[PDB]
């Protein structure tokens, strides 16, 4: 297992049944692919820099995980399958290098 940050951005426009729901599905995918959860930072609406799926903005969340480094790739493909997940980026954890620090 290694430590990762899964990044998910969604289309903002959702009602709460819809948002809670896609978040839940994400949860069950994470749970299913072997991923432990450690932290969650859900930042919500940020105005994007350039349009993504015709939307000026996105609904962000971030998930620190530790999961079998075999399965990261598939857990990514399954995260992405849902239509209303606009972008998904999984990254390995690096420690916090700081300069001019």
């Amino acid at each position: 297992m290694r430590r990762y940050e899964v990044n998910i951005v969604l289309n903002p426009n959702l009602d709460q049944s819809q948002l809670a729901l896609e978040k839940e599905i994400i949860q069950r995918a994470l749970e299913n692919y072997g991923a432990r959860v450690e932290k969650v930072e859900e930042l919500g609406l940020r105005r994007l820099a350039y349009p993504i799926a015709k939307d000026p903005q996105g609904y962000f969340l971030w998930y620190q995980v530790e999961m079998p480094e075999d399965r990261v790739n598939d857990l990514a493909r399954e995260l992405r399958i849902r239509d209303n997940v606009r972008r998904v980026m999984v990254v390995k954890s690096q420690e916090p290098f700081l300069a001019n620090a």
Partner: protein, 70 residues
């Protein structure tokens, strides 16, 4: 005509999530600034590139903007 890391806090260079800081390293045009103006170091620089490009993908920073006046 001064340098970036000069006036700026003491900060994560590995942060793809943190725009409020990273924007400061880009041109009016979407461009990443050369060392000559970021005041960085060769390694510092490389990490700044990668963290921008990641950030860019996430829609947090621009791949390009447009030049004003001219």
């Amino acid at each position: 005509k001064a340098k970036v890391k000069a006036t700026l806090g003491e900060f994560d260079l590995r942060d793809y999530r943190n725009v409020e800081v990273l924007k400061r390293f880009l041109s009016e045009t979407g461009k990443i600034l050369p060392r000559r103006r970021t005041g960085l170091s060769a390694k510092e620089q490389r990490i700044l590139a990668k963290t921008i490009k990641r950030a860019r993908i996430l829609g947090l920073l621009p791949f390009t903007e447009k030049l004003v006046r001219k």
